[PDB]
Ligand binder design. Structure first.
Ligand SMILES: *C(=O)[C@@H]([C@@H]1N=C(C(=O)O)[C@@H](S[C@@H]2CN[C@H](C(=O)N(C)C)C2)[C@@H]1C)[C@@H](C)O
Length: 268
């Protein structure tokens, strides 16, 4: 090791996901998020070495100035081992910022889990390695607030969570201020789309869209989803009146056409 001089005002640390040793779904990108905006994005990329077994072609794309993603063209093949070496220690990241340390993570791809929410049938169907394991009636976004179509990556899971409209800057005791307690919530977009328990819409699930954009399912189906779906599994939404989920949402990565993703967007 070669020592690098440093100052707490001129250092930035990388954080890698997913965690070391984790088993993730086929949609999980590698994510490296820095604790500061990066000016030399080309230098960061060059510092990161991703190796796969079986080997598959992949590429980097920046979600924003803090976070870079790497994925293949198509969903991961189950069983794949992925090694990530972020060799940023002492790397000049531009504007006098330097990499603070190296981080190394290793993870594996589990079963192919793909759930399709079809707005034509109002059924959410979960396939594991091509086989249907579960059908759930669902209620998605009403016409004024539709659920976007596209490919969503499963993120965090919560036994209980608060949906508070003021974090979207729209207060309660307001036009639409809500503060709502929700059980068994699985996050599928950074914009705040969740699959979750909705006892208040059980009669509509399978028939009519009534939500603000979330996938409302029954309490027991929502608990099922929470138990059986992991980070990196895929939810595909089709046939809604909405547009397409933004590719830079945070969990929207697969919505970016491969030619654009591969070309990348790194200021070098
Ligand atoms: C889920 O139902 C939650 C709501 N779902 C949303 C979504 O589908 O993205 C948003 S509301 C929607 C997104 N953009 C519009 C807006 O005015 N902004 C918030 C910027 C409307 C919301 C988190 C919630 C009800 O649990």
């Amino acid at each position: 090791l070669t020592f690098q001089t440093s100052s707490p005002a001129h250092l930035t640390m990388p954080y890698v996901m997913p965690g070391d040793g984790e088993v993730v779904g086929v949609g999980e990108p590698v994510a490296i998020r820095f604790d500061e905006n990066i000016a030399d994005r080309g230098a960061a990329e060059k510092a990161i070495k991703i190796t796969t077994n079986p080997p598959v072609e992949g590429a980097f794309y920046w979600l924003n100035n803090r976070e870079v993603r790497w994925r293949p063209e198509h969903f991961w093949k189950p069983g794949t081992a992925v090694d990530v070496a972020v060799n940023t220690y002492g790397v000049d990241l531009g504007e006098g910022m330097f990499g603070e340390d190296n981080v190394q993570t290793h993870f594996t791809i589990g079963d192919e889990v793909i759930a399709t929410a079809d707005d034509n049938t109002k059924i959410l169907t979960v396939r594991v390695n091509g086989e249907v394991v579960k059908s759930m009636p669902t209620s998605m976004g009403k016409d004024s607030t539709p659920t976007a179509n596209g490919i969503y990556i499963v993120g965090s899971r919560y036994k209980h969570i608060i949906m508070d409209s003021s974090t979207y800057g729209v207060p309660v005791n307001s036009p639409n201020g809500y503060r709502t307690d929700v059980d068994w919530a699985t996050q599928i977009s950074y914009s705040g789309v969740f699959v979750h328990s909705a006892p208040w819409s059980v009669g509509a699930q399978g028939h009519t869209n009534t939500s603000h954009g979330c996938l409302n399912v029954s309490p027991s189906n929502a608990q099922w989803f929470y138990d059986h779906v992991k980070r990196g599994d895929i939810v595909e939404v089709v046939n809604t009146v909405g547009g397409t989920l933004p590719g830079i949402d945070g969990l929207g990565d697969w919505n970016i056409p491969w030619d654009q993703w591969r070309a990348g967007n790194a200021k070098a």
